[PDB]
Each structure stands twice: as structure tokens, then as C-alpha cells.
Amino acid sequence: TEQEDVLAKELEDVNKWGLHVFRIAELSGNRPLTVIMHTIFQERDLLKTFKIPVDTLITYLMTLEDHYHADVAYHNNIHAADVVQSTHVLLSTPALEAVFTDLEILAAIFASAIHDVDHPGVSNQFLINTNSELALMYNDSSVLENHHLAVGFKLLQEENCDIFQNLTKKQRQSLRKMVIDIVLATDMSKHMNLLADLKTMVETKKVTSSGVLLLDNYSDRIQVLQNMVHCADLSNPTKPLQLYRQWTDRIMEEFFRQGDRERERGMEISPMCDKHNASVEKSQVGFIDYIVHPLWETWADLVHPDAQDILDTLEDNREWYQSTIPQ
Amino acid sequence: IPRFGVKTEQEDVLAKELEDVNKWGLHVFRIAELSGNRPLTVIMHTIFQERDLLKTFKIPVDTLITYLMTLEDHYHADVAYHNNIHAADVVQSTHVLLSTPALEAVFTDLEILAAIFASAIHDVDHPGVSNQFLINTNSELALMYNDSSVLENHHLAVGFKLLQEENCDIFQNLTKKQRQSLRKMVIDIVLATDMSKHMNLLADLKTMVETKKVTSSGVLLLDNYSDRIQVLQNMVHCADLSNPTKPLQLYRQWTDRIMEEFFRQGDRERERGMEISPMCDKHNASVEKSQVGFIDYIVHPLWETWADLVHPDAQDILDTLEDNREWYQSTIPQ
Amino acid sequence: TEQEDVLAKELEDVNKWGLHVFRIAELSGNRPLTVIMHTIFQERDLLKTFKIPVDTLITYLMTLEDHYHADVAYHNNIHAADVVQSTHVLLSTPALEAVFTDLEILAAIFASAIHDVDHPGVSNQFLINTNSELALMYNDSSVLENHHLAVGFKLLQEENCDIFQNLTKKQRQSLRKMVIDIVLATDMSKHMNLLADLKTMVETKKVTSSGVLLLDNYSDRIQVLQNMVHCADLSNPTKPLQLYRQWTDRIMEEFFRQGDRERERGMEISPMCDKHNASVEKSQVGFIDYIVHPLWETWADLVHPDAQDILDTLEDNREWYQSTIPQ
Amino acid sequence: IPRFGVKTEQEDVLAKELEDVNKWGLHVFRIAELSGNRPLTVIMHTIFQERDLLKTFKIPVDTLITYLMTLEDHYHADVAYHNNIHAADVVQSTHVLLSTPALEAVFTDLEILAAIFASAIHDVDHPGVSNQFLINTNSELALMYNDSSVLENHHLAVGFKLLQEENCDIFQNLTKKQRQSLRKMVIDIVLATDMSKHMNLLADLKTMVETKKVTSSGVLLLDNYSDRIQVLQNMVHCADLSNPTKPLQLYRQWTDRIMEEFFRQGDRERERGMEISPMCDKHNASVEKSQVGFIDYIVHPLWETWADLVHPDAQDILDTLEDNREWYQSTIPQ
Ligand SMILES: Nc1ncnc2c1ncn2[C@@H]1O[C@H](COP(=O)(O)O)[C@@H](O)[C@H]1O
Ligand SMILES: Nc1ncnc2c1ncn2[C@@H]1O[C@H](COP(=O)(O)O)[C@@H](O)[C@H]1O
Ligand SMILES: Nc1ncnc2c1ncn2[C@@H]1O[C@H](COP(=O)(O)O)[C@@H](O)[C@H]1O
Ligand SMILES: Nc1ncnc2c1ncn2[C@@H]1O[C@H](COP(=O)(O)O)[C@@H](O)[C@H]1O
Ligand SMILES: [Zn+2]
Ligand SMILES: [Zn+2]
Ligand SMILES: [Zn+2]
Ligand SMILES: [Zn+2]
Ligand SMILES: [Zn+2]
Ligand SMILES: [Zn+2]
Ligand SMILES: [Zn+2]
Ligand SMILES: [Zn+2]
């Protein structure tokens, strides 16, 4: 059938930075995370490396994606699918070739898939300020991130959902620890620290006769996986404008809605969340200059030059928005 | 939003739509659009004010609005039926039922408050699927509630739990006695929305309508608690299953939504190879038959018995129901 | 080897109604629940029947036992060990010989060992009056019973404790529903109905040619397991005096402690919980007349005459107490 | 209503004992017996009255006592060390440390309230086993808190959670700013009691001492929140690791209790077939040797540092520690 052919053609660029993820969501009946995750899992022969029954994986993937909110413009299954697919490409970078095991790769991928599951569409601070049960439960510390990990794992325990049923205790335990570490790193309050470490790791870069980086201890191997997935999560600004633009309008819609919510209860309107005093263009350039670029610049210097085009794409989007700035 | 305490010219239109709050058939879907998807917050506020519930229970307005919005925020916008619109619908419907002649001055303000509050939280945080589905899938929700009245227990837990958020305890000024009473009634009412309790509830209601004692004003006479809570439980149960009794234009909107939700479940069940639940197979659909099936075995027996209890008060509602049944009979393709 | 030989001998009375359960508590190292369970399981060959790895089984029993409060005088591991063994003997009752299946038997025994796990030492009403988290979670309905179940299961997910790992998706669903049905039947507010139904069923009792009780549908089969475990839980007044008295003292200590707790908070003091207006004896007689006797009078009916010595001990034990009531 | 928070017929002796509430070395075990096992309720009540916290934060007396009894009720009576007596001890020690001359007028009342409240809940609902044990069994606890500071996150959650039981919200009259400020501090303080953070906590304290500043009055100058909370964290951390600095008669009771708990875990660890944790093997126990090690590598380095920060205020405390160290030294059987 035609509709299926168009989907398959789109899925062909799965290993490409710039996948038409939105197009894919439209064609799979809004199951981008499921299709992309299953596709990426065959391209990596993961189902076979870990003996993952076909039906189990699909059932879990459908369930996980079902626990992403369809009423949320940004933090939904499309964003999940996108970070997953982005990490997938980052993993295949030449400077990291052969560096990670099948388990560590399965970790950064699973982590990415669940990194924002059941996201309410509001920031940690909003959850804290309203005294939400979630905030009370996690003591105001990485409330959302802890909850994401929590739901991600808990969903494994559903009927025919354990995609790690055939792993070994030694493996499940190792996978668990890595996913926790990666996801908790997606919390922006950890950004500044993650970047500092990343830089220090680039000023002690160690390559091999194969030119590929050398990762001795766990602390170094995980630190790359954290920045990797962190990079994927903050990758929309480095994608083809057509994509970046959809992400921006979606993220802003969510901030404005949070702003309305805060303006409903008379709270101070959060930054960038006020639709009556907004600078969408300014904010984007600001977000890139103080966070996105300073981060990706360090990532490029790590896998130099495997990401030269990505950084270049980012600098051009930076200007595209700039040359759109009124006052 | 009002410039100098004076309405906005949309907020005004909302206000005029809300003049039919005491009427069966309120344009709830419009009110939802007009209020910015705040049908639950505005209809609850309207009802609390009219029934003078804020002064009687010393509920500060800010706390009420904040809670309401918080409660409404916890209904799922991505759910076609079990959302804030259905909640607002059930609240306003119970509100109209409470005002019936046959029950005039029968319930105390605390019982009224419980019927309305229970209506507002009755389906909060509904995931869009049934109890059976959560059970067969091994959801944590089902395990927590040991597969018994899973959703109903969860709705209650969430409804009360939300009272604890910043400036959300609308019952802060009720004495412990008032709170323990309110709470038991609200729990008794919401658990009674579970369909598995349907038959027994109806049976006791018929049994009541039989031994039914009345007058002093021609109004119903309720002795003990078992009787009063039983009536209130059926009252909210009737409001929850009242869509088939509303004007056809409303009823069909409700049907599309529940059917959509039923199909989405059928789809999700199928994807997993699970036995497809009744009415859920969007491929072997019999919408027209479903409604007739639903009206003859559940809705009509219920409202007929309810019409008996408060007769003649509910004649028009029973008629509209009987009339909506025929209409669906026609629609049945042969 | 000194107290061990002594413990083995003591277990020779496992299928006997009146086990010196307390000795087994000392001799076993405060593991009455773990040992009685390990023995009973091997006997009914439940380990081989459901392929229960000796490891897991013991590991769950230990996780479960540890989850019984050692500070609580009554509702603890000894009581749970008592109920499991009392239930055991009841299942081996002749009039019921060959009625229940290996799966139903496992339920009954499992339901018993967890029927009171993690009991706080206070009644549901106390938890309800204080707006305890547990009561808010279960809506003031069977608060402790719901909790008992929830911990019974969740504790399976611990480390190598999932005993029912070698059962089918069909078995596990049956057991689960049976365990839940049983445990929730122990809630006293359910007592009246369970008795009325048990009696109504004794009125329409039916057997096969061999005289084996004929339990047709699920309603009947579970209603018998429910009341059975209910009789076990309410069996201390039917045990030899020497036992009954230790139990009565232990529950009164718990009642009084709850009473002191209510007194400190200016709360109304529950019945039997006021050590200043106590009638410990009048209470035992009252308890036996309105509840224990009517329940046991009917169970003896159903298993005529398997339980007669039991019933007789009950009427005798009531007398010993009645003679202690002053005035 | 009663004098010291609870009812007691030995009130006289309890009264004389509580007179030493401002002194290092309080007979906490004796107060625990005289109070009817209510050491935490009585000592907290005494401290709040003494520091005039009820009036300053408009805390109703009945709400304070109700909360205190609830909190105390949630420490396990079957745990030899991490119980309500330890909680009471740590509270009273923090109270003494807050009164040190070098810190006079340095902390606000809200910071004082936070440090004391944090101390009272710091180990609430302790199971009697380490985080490692909870992690190596995949316990629901070790899973809710992604293996990071399991017990500490749980102590905080339960402590704050109990504020929601009937008449237990002792912070009901503080403003939103005060409640948010208090909460963060309490949270920062209790997480810091995790031993896994000791070394880093100690380093930062040394950095502070090395660059120690004093005001016109010989009291510590603490500008930013970071230095403020840091002092408070080390302060409660010191109080938690203060038993080796109390009169030997007290230290020895604490050592017997802590070891009895370590051995309860050692047993359980070999039952489930696990690697016995340090100091938990009751067959190869070097108790005296352990104390010497604990003092040498943890307690002494920590108190010597606190002592420099408040020099010479803690000279006697540091002296008693050293005497207790040498005492166990002479007990070690070679
Ligand atoms: N296009 C964007 N514009 C502005 N902020 C963004 C954008 N993309 C990501 N962010 C920020 O990065 C954060 C990453 O966290 P999360 O959204 O939870 O993955 C978001 O919460 C935003 O605050
Ligand atoms: N229009 C309708 N057609 C068919 N079934 C309905 C309709 N309205 C309600 N129901 C059923 O009645 C239940 C009422 O419970 P709920 O609405 O979920 O509180 C629904 O879950 C459906 O199973
Ligand atoms: N010996 C006894 N004397 C008085 N009441 C008892 C005795 N044994 C059990 N009960 C009651 O029976 C109930 C049975 O439920 P439980 O013991 O909680 O499983 C207890 O909660 C007590 O209230
Ligand atoms: N007397 C003691 N002997 C040995 N270790 C101790 C002693 N007192 C405290 N500790 C250690 O300090 C930790 C403080 O944590 P906690 O007691 O859980 O707040 C304990 O878990 C022990 O590891
Ligand atoms: Zn995120
Ligand atoms: Zn994200
Ligand atoms: Zn419902
Ligand atoms: Zn409903
Ligand atoms: Zn019980
Ligand atoms: Zn029991
Ligand atoms: Zn601690
Ligand atoms: Zn401590």
C-alpha cells in the first residue's frame, strides 16, 4: 500500500541526522516512538543480541508511548522518538566507533526512549511551587527526571512488557544503573556541571592507533553517554530549520500554556512563559548562545570532526532567527 | 480578566450560557469552548455560589478556584469522553437532580456538598481505558487496588489528594465531624459509579420505591443513612448515565466521544492480541445497536425507577430518553 | 543440633491443631513463619508441583517475615505463622478431602502467610481518624487488608522472591484473584456476610458418591477458602487454653497500646482499648459468643465431624474465661 | 495540657532531668524512661518552648504535640539504634550546637527551626538496615529513589508527609516564602546526613575554616546561603555523629545499640545468602577496634574541624572524644 511505502522510505533515513520525525508520526497513526524504536532495534540487531521477543518489544513500546501525553506540544512521543533517533546517530559517530558495548548502547537508547515519559507539560519548579505530590515524593530534587525513570521501569512490569526478561542479573543490574545515570543527567540544573566535566574530558582526550577515543573507567564512559543523550535532548536547534521550527513553536506553546496556568493561580509568570511579553526569536538566539552552542561546541571538540556539519547547521539556525529579530 | 470588575465580551456570552445551569440540556460543550476549556471550574463555581456553599462552609474563593482548576487540570484533555467536560456535565446534572420537587428540602447542605463534590472528582485522572483493561495488562493501578474498582478508587484518591496542593484545601474550615461525614458520603457515592455495582444499586432503589414512604409536603421521606446515601448514590449514578436522556444534539456528541474512546481501547487491545472488549471493535461496529442495547438494559430501567421515585418530576427526561431510543432504532441499518 | 533436634520433633505436630507455635518461634530463631512454611510446602510437594526453587521460596518467606513488626505483640510473624499452620490443618480436613486443587491450596496457604504483613498494631478506624496516608490511599475501606495484599505481592518483586515464577499466565491470574479474595475476607466488617453465605451454603450442602464435598462454581469454592482462612485467623479461642491465653494477653497489650495512643491525642478511646475501664474477660466471652462461636459452629457443620474437638475446646475455653468475670 | 508535653506520674524527676536540656551529656535514656518512651516529644516540646518557637511561628500547642507524637510513633521501637531516642539525642545535640557562643545571633529563627526540625525527622521510619542492603534486594524503597540516598530521601518524605495527618501541620501559619525556605533547608540538611557525603562535606568545612571570617562581634560571618546551609549541614551531621563525644556512660550505650543493629543485619545478610557488611559479623566482631577506627577516620577529623570553626567553644567536647578513644584502645583484645 502507498501509505506504507511512504513510511518505509521516510524510515530509510533513520541513521541520518535530520530524520523527518514529524512526517513519520503522521504516517504511523501517531506511533513514531514505536516505529523508530523498533526500526533502530533491528538496524542494531538488538532484539537478537538480547533475545527480545518481537511481541514483547512492540507491546512495551506501545505502552511506553501511551504513557507520553498527546495533549503536550513538546514533551510527547515525537520528542521521545526524536531524542532516541538522535542518540542513535550520535552513537554511530566515527570517533566513538567500537567504544561502547551492546549493553551500554542499549542503555543510552532505552534511557532516551523514557527520558520524559508521562511529562505533565510543566517544569519541576511549577510542581514544587504547587506542592504537587510528585514534588513531595522526590523532595524537590529532579522531580520530573526521577518520575520519568520511575515510570519507564515500572512499565516493564506490565503484561508481556519486560523486554529484558532474557537478560542476566549481571546485565539487568548494569543496564539499570546506566539508565538512571543518563536520565538523571537530562535535568537542566545539572547542565553547567555536565559541560564543565565534558570540557575537562576534552582537555585530556585520549585516542588510539585507530584514532577512536579511549574510555578506560566507568566515570568517563558514562560521562560521554550522559552528554551524548543530553546533546540529543537539546538537539532541535542543530536540526534542519524545517524541523527546528516545529520544535520551537511546540516548546513555546507549552511554555505559554504553563504561563497561562501560572497566571490562573496568580503565580509569577515563569521565564519565556508569558505570551503577552514574549521574544520567541530573542529567546531562541539566547538559548543557543548560552546553552546549546556552548554545549555542542564541546561535543564537536570531542569527536572532532564527526560533528562539523551539525555545529555548522546550528550556527546557521542561530542567524536565521537573529535576522528575524524585531524589538 | 475583567476591566474594572466588568465582564469581557466573551466572558459575557459565557455568563449568559450559564443562565441555564438549573436546566437539563445545558450547552456544556459550548461553555467548554467559551471558558477556554474550563467547563468544570466555571460550572462548579456557578453552582457553589447559587447554592451559597462558600458562605455556608466558609470556603475562601481563591482556594475554591485554585482547587477547581487543579482538579480540572487532572482530567485528561487527550481523552474523548472521560474528561473535564464529562465531569462538568455530571456535576450540573446532579445539581439539577438535587433541585427536584420531590426532594425539596430533604438533604442537608453537607449532603448536597458531597453529591456535587463527588460528581466533580468521580472520573478524575481517567486514562481512557476500562478497569478490565488495567487488570489484564497488569497496570500498577490495578495491583495497588487489588483489581477491585480500580479506576473508581483512583479517582477518589486523586480527588482528595489534590486538596493538599498549595491553597487547595476547600474544606479547611469544616470541623472534623463535618469532614468525616462528607468524606464517607463522597467515597460511598463515587464507588457506586462502578458499573459492577449497577444491578444491586438499582435493585435497592426499586425496593425503596416500593416501600417508599412520603409526604408532609408531598416530598420524599428518608429515615436512616442507608436510605439517604442510597438515593444520592443513585442520583449521581443517574447523572453519570444521563447523556442518553439529553437532547439528541447533546447525546450524539457524547456517543461519538465514548465510542471513539471505546475504539481507541479496542485498537490498543488488538495491537497486543488481547480479546477485544464489547463495542470496542471499530471494524465490527454496531453503534446504533449498542445505544439501543445500552438504553434498554441499563439506562431506561434506571431512569424509569428514578422517575418512579420522584414522579412526576422526571417525566420529560424519561420521555426524551424513550424518544432517543426510537430515533436510534431507525438509524439501525437493516 | 541441641535445640534443632528439639525443633524437628516439635514440627512432627505440623498437621495437628494445637502446635506449640511459640516454641517454634524461639527454637527457629524467631522464624516461625519461615519454617512452618518450608515444611508445609515440602509436604504437599508444592516445590516440585509448581517448580518452586528452594532458594526463592525461602528468600520470599524471609522477606515477608521481616516485614512483620517485631514490636507488635499480636499481629506479627507468630500470628501469621499460626494462621498458615491452622489453615494447613484445615485443608487436610477429611470431610473436605480431595476437594481443592494444588493451585487453590497454594492460594489459601499463601494468602495466610501474608494476610497481616506489615500490620502497624492499630485498627483501620485509627488509621482513618488520623488521615493516615494508608487510609487516604485506600479510601477508608479495608485499609489494612488492601495494604496487606499490596505488600504481599510487591514483596514478590524483591530479590529472588518471585516464587510463582514457574506458573502460567493463566495460573498466576487464578492464584492472584484467589489470594486477594481471601485476604479481603479477613476484614471484620465483611464477617457478617461471609457467615450468612457460609451458613446458606451449609443449608444447601452437596456431595458426591464418596462423600467428597461438591463445590461447583467459583463463588462456592472461594467462599469456602475465604471462611476457612477466616476461621484460621479467628482460631486462637479454639486452641488449647494454654495457647489461647497467651494470644489473648498479646492482643490486649496491643489494644491497650492503641488506647494509650488515642488517649495522648485526646481521641475517643476504642472499645477494649482502655486499660482503665477494661473487662478483658467479659470481652473474650463477648467475642466468643457474638463472633467466634457462630463462625466455628458453622464450619464444624460443613466438615462434620472433622471439627468437634475444636468446637468443644472453644466452649470449654469460653467457660474458663466466663468464670474469671467478677461481679 | 501536661507540663512537658506528655502525661507522667514521675513528672518531678522528668522536670529536673530536662533542666540539662542545654547541656552536652543530657541523660536522654533516662528521659526516655521517665517520659514513657516519649523522649522526642518531650525534648522537642522543651526546646520549642525554650526558644519561643511556638509564639514566633504561631504554632498551636496541640498541633505541635500531635505532630511530635506522630513523628515519634513513626520511628521503629524494634530498632536498637535508629529510633526515637537517637532522634531525640540528635535534636538536643543540634540545639546545644546552635547555642554555641561563636554562632550567637548568626542564624535566623527560620534557620534555627529548620535545623531542629531536620534533626527530629532525619531518621524517621528507619528499617534498621543500610542503603546498600535496601539496594541489593531491589526493595521498593531503593527503586523509588533510583538507588541514590534511599533512606535519607525516605526520612524526608515521611517527615513532611506526617504534617498532613489530623492536626499535624505545625507550619500552617508560616507564609509561602517561609515554608519554601524552610523546606529547602530541611531537605538540604537531611540529605547531607548520608555518609556517602561525609568526605566532601568535611572538605568544604575545612575550606571554610581556612578562610574563616568573624564580625565586629566574635561570631561567624556567613554571607550567602551556600555558606549558611553548609554550616547547618555540618552542624546536624556533627550532632548525628556525636555519641563518641558524650560522657562515656552514654557513648557505650550508643555503641551497644548500634552494634546490636549491625549484627541484626549481619544475620539477615547471611540468611539471604549475601556478603556480610563491615562490622556486621557477630562472629568476627572487633567492636572496640571498630570504635577506634570510626573515631580515628571519621568522628575526630570531623569534630576537630568543627572545633576550629567555633574555637574554643567545643574544646571540652573534643577532649571527651579523645578520652573515649583511648578507653576503647585499652579494651581492644589482641
Ligand atoms: N527550542 C528550544 N527553545 C527553548 N528552550 C528549549 C528548546 N529545546 C529545549 N529547551 C529547553 O531545554 C529543556 C530540556 O529539558 P526537557 O524539555 O525536559 O527535555 C527544556 O525543558 C527547555 O527549557
Ligand atoms: N452513551 C453511552 N453509550 C454506551 N455506554 C455508555 C454511554 N455512556 C456511558 N456508558 C457506559 O457507562 C459507563 C459509565 O461510567 P463512567 O462514564 O466511566 O463513569 C461508561 O464507562 C460506559 O461503559
Ligand atoms: N483473642 C481475641 N480476642 C479478641 N478479639 C480478637 C481476638 N483474636 C482476634 N480478635 C479480633 O479479630 C480481628 C481479626 O482480624 P486480624 O486479627 O486483624 O486479622 C482482630 O483484628 C481482632 O479485633
Ligand atoms: N557509635 C558508632 N559506631 C560506629 N559507627 C557509628 C556510630 N554512630 C554512628 N555511626 C556511623 O554513622 C552513621 C550515621 O548515620 P545514621 O545513624 O543512619 O544517621 C551510621 O550509619 C554509622 O555508619
Ligand atoms: Zn526532560
Ligand atoms: Zn526531553
Ligand atoms: Zn467512571
Ligand atoms: Zn463518569
Ligand atoms: Zn488482619
Ligand atoms: Zn490476623
Ligand atoms: Zn540517617
Ligand atoms: Zn542519625
Q: DSSP assignment, residue C308?
A: S
Stated in angstroms to one decimal place, the resolution of this structure is 2.3
Alpha-carbon gap, residue C171 to C106, rounded angstroms: 11
Distance of alpha carbon D159 from the chain centroid:
14
CB A249: neighbour CB atoms within 10 A? 12
Rounded (5°) CA angle A21-A23-A26? 110
Closest C-alpha among D83, D75, D178, D194 to residue D125: D75
Closest C-alpha among B240, B23, B268 to residue B137: B268
Closest C-alpha among A58, A116, A105, A59 to residue A83: A116
- SS3 readout for chain B: CCCCCCCCCCHHHHHHHHHHCCCCCCCHHHHHHHCCCCHHHHHHHHHHHHCCHHHHCCCCHHHHHHHHHHHHHCCCCCCCCCCHHHHHHHHHHHHHHHCCHHHCCCCCHHHHHHHHHHHHHCCCCCCCCCHHHHHHCCCHHHHHCCCCCHHHHHHHHHHHHHHHCCCCCCCCCCCHHHHHHHHHHHHHHHHCCCHHHHHHHHHHHHHHHHHCCCCCCCCCCCCCHHHHHHHHHHHHHHHHCCHHHCCHHHHHHHHHHHHHHHHHHHHHHHHCCCCCCCCCCCCCCCHHHHHHHHHHHHHHHHHHHHHHHHCCCCHHHHHHHHHHHHHHHHHCCC
Alpha-carbon gap, residue B34 to B27, rounded angstroms: 11
CB A274: neighbour CB atoms within 10 A? 18
Q: DSSP assignment, residue C167?
A: S
Looking at the DSSP bridge assignments, the partners of residue C80 are: none
What is the crossing angle of helices D248-271 and D315-329, to 10°?
Answer: 60
CB B109: neighbour CB atoms within 10 A? 13
Nearest residue by C-alpha to atom 11 in ligand 1: A234
* Cβ C24 vs Cβ C12: under 8 Å: no
Which ligand has the shortest distance to the CA of D87?
Answer: 12
Q: From the candidates D82, D154, D198, D237, which is the catalytic residue?
A: D82
- Write the Ramachandran bin of C159: left for phi over 0, alpha for psi from -120 to 50, otherwise beta: beta
Alpha-carbon gap, residue D302 to D199, rounded angstroms: 9
Q: Is the peptide bond before D39 cis (omega within 30 degrees of 0)?
A: no
Q: What SS3 state is found at C215? A: coil
Q: Is the peptide bond before B312 cis (omega within 30 degrees of 0)?
A: yes
- C188 touches ligand 3 (CB under 6 Å): yes
Nearest residue by C-alpha to atom 13 in ligand 1: A188
Closest C-alpha among B327, B329, B320, B322 to residue B301: B322
What is the crossing angle of helices D109-121 and D61-73, to 10°?
Answer: 30
- Give Rg (Cα) of chain B: 20
Closest C-alpha among A115, A110, A235 to residue A183: A115
* Cβ A89 vs Cβ A17: under 8 Å: yes
Backbone angles phi, psi at D214, to 5 degrees: -125, 150
Closest C-alpha among C45, C49, C38, C46 to residue C85: C38
Alpha-carbon gap, residue D92 to D239, rounded angstroms: 8
Alpha-carbon gap, residue C54 to C57, rounded angstroms: 5
- SS3 readout for B151-201: HHHHHHHHHHHHHHCCCCCCCCCCCHHHHHHHHHHHHHHHHCCCHHHHHHH
Q: What is the largest CA-CA distance in chain D?
A: 61
Nearest by CB to C139, which of B147, B156, B180? B156
A284 marked ligand binding residue: yes
Q: Give the burial class of B263: count Cβ atoms within 10 A of its Cβ; 0-12 exposed, 13-18 middle, 19 or more buried.
A: middle
Chain C residues in contact with chain B using a Cβ-Cβ cutoff of 8 Å = 129, 136-141, 146, 149-150, 153-154, 176-177, 180, 184
Q: What SS3 state is found at C65? A: helix
A287 marked ligand binding residue: yes
Q: DSSP assignment, residue C207?
A: B
Closest C-alpha among C198, C190, C193 to residue C228: C198
Closest C-alpha among C62, C70, C74 to residue C33: C62
Q: What SS3 state is found at C47? A: helix
Closest C-alpha among D146, D153, D147, D88 to residue D126: D153
Backbone angles phi, psi at C141, to 5 degrees: -120, 115
List CB contacts (< 8 A) between A184 and chain D.
146, 148
| Ligand 3 atom showing the smallest separation from residue C255 Cα | 23
C-alpha cell at D25: 551529656
* DSSP H/E element including C79: helix C77-91
Which of D240, D250, D254, D261 maximizes ligand 4 atoms within 8 Å of its Cβ, making it the mutation to test the pocket?
Answer: D240
* Cβ C133 vs Cβ C82: under 8 Å: no
C-alpha cell at A181: 545515570
Q: Does C139 contact B153 at a Cβ distance shorter than 8 Å?
A: yes
A38: CB partners within 8 A, 6+ apart: A57, A58, A61
Domains of chain A: 1-327 (1.10.1300.10)
- Structural method: X-ray
Closest C-alpha among B91, B69, B84 to residue B167: B69
Alpha-carbon gap, residue A6 to A13, rounded angstroms: 12
Closest C-alpha among B54, B50, B52, B57 to residue B65: B54
C233: CB partners within 8 A, 6+ apart: C83, C112, C115, C186
A31, B159, B299 from B81: Cα distances, Å: 22, 18, 18
Q: Is the peptide bond before A326 cis (omega within 30 degrees of 0)?
A: no
Half-sphere exposure of D319 (CA within 13 A, CB side): 7
CB C280: neighbour CB atoms within 10 A? 17
Ligand 1 mean position, distance from CA A255 (Å): 10
Rounded (5°) CA angle B311-B312-B315? 110
A327: CB partners within 8 A, 6+ apart: none
* DSSP H/E element including C124: helix C124-129
Q: Give the burial class of C192: count Cβ atoms within 10 A of its Cβ; 0-12 exposed, 13-18 middle, 19 or more buried.
A: exposed
B106: CB partners within 8 A, 6+ apart: B219, B220, B222
Q: Does D187 contact A146 at a Cβ distance shorter than 8 Å?
A: no
Alpha-carbon gap, residue D257 to D79, rounded angstroms: 9
Closest C-alpha among B118, B115, C63 to residue D271: C63
For CA atoms D58, D61, D63, D64, give the dihedral sign: positive
Is residue C75 among the annotated active site residues?
yes
Q: What SS3 state is found at C117? A: coil
Alpha-carbon gap, residue A152 to B292, rounded angstroms: 42
Alpha-carbon gap, residue A303 to A177, rounded angstroms: 25
Nearest by CB to B139, which of A59, A62, A158? A158
Q: Give the burial class of C204: count Cβ atoms within 10 A of its Cβ; 0-12 exposed, 13-18 middle, 19 or more buried.
A: exposed
Q: How far apart are the first and last CA of chain D?
A: 56
Alpha-carbon gap, residue A219 to A171, rounded angstroms: 18
C-alpha cell at B189: 457515592
Stated length of chain D: 334
Q: Does A136 contact D161 at a Cβ distance shorter than 8 Å?
A: yes
Alpha-carbon gap, residue A286 to A284, rounded angstroms: 5
* Cβ A213 vs Cβ A142: under 8 Å: no
Q: Is the peptide bond before A305 cis (omega within 30 degrees of 0)?
A: yes
- B265 touches ligand 2 (CB under 6 Å): no
- SS3 readout for chain A: CHHHHHHHHHHCCCCCCCCCHHHHHHHCCCCHHHHHHHHHHHHCCHHHHCCCCHHHHHHHHHHHHHCCCCCCCCCCHHHHHHHHHHHHHHHCCHHHCCCCCHHHHHHHHHHHHHCCCCCCCCCHHHHHHCCCHHHHHCCCCCHHHHHHHHHHHHHHHCCCCCCCCCCCHHHHHHHHHHHHHHHHHCCHHHHHHHHHHHHHHHCCCCECCCCCECCCCHHHHHHHHHHHHHHHHCCHHHCCHHHHHHHHHHHHHHHHHHHHHHHHCCCCCCCCCCCCCCCHHHHHHHHHHHHHHHHHHHHHCCCCCCCHHHHHHHHHHHHHHHCCCCC
Alpha-carbon gap, residue A24 to A18, rounded angstroms: 12
* Cβ B205 vs Cβ B306: under 8 Å: yes
* Cβ A126 vs Cβ A258: under 8 Å: yes
Dihedral of CA atoms A67, A70, A74, A76 in degrees, nearest 10, equals: 30
Which of A78, A79, A192, A251 maximizes ligand 1 atoms within 8 Å of its Cβ, making it the mutation to test the pocket?
Answer: A251
Q: From the candidates A75, A88, A147, A293, which is the catalytic residue?
A: A75
* Cβ B212 vs Cβ B227: under 8 Å: no
Q: From the candidates C38, C67, C75, C191, which is the catalytic residue?
A: C75
Subunits that touch chain D (at least 3 Cβ pairs < 8 angstroms)?
A, B, C
Nearest residue by C-alpha to atom 21 in ligand 2: B130
Closest C-alpha among C34, C11, C40, C15 to residue C23: C11
Closest C-alpha among D313, D90, D104, D307 to residue D222: D104
Cell 499463601 found at? C110
Sequence letter at residue A205: K
CB C37: neighbour CB atoms within 10 A? 28
Q: What SS3 state is found at C213? A: strand
Alpha-carbon gap, residue B5 to B8, rounded angstroms: 9
What is the crossing angle of helices D315-329 and D287-294, to 10°?
Answer: 150
Backbone angles phi, psi at D80, to 5 degrees: -60, -30
Sequence letter at residue D196: S
Nearest residue by C-alpha to atom 5 in ligand 2: B294
List CB contacts (< 8 A) between D70 and chain C.
130
- SS3 readout for chain D: CCCCCCCCCCHHHHHHHHHHHHCCCCCHHHHHHHCCCCHHHHHHHHHHHHCCHHHHCCCCHHHHHHHHHHHHHCCCCCCCCCCHHHHHHHHHHHHHHHCCHHHCCCCCHHHHHHHHHHHHHCCCCCCCCCHHHHHCCCCHHHHHCCCCCHHHHHHHHHHHHHHHCCCCCCCCCCCHHHHHHHHHHHHHHHHCCCHHHHHHHHHHHHHHHHCCCECCCCCECCCCHHHHHHHHHHHHHHHHCCHHHCCHHHHHHHHHHHHHHHHHHHHHHHHCCCCCCCCCCCCCCCHHHHHHHHHHHHHHHHHHHHHHHCCCCCHHHHHHHHHHHHHHHCCCCC
Ligand 11 mean position, distance from CA D237 (Å): 9
- In B154-169, which positions are buried (b, 16+ CB within 10 angstroms) versus exposed (e)? bbbbbbbbbbbbbbbb
A116 marked ligand binding residue: yes
Ligand 8 mean position, distance from CA A159 (Å): 27
Distance of alpha carbon A229 from the chain centroid:
6
Alpha-carbon gap, residue A41 to A88, rounded angstroms: 10
Which of C251, C252, C257 maximizes ligand 3 atoms within 8 Å of its Cβ, making it the mutation to test the pocket?
Answer: C251
* Cβ D124 vs Cβ D160: under 8 Å: no
* DSSP H/E element including C83: helix C77-91
| Ligand 3 atom showing the smallest separation from residue C233 Cα | 19
C-alpha cell at B91: 456535576
- Write the Ramachandran bin of B107: left for phi over 0, alpha for psi from -120 to 50, otherwise beta: beta
Q: Which residue in A has a C-alpha nearest to residue B270's C-alpha?
A: A59
Ligand 9 mean position, distance from CA C80 (Å): 9
Distance of alpha carbon C71 from the chain centroid:
19
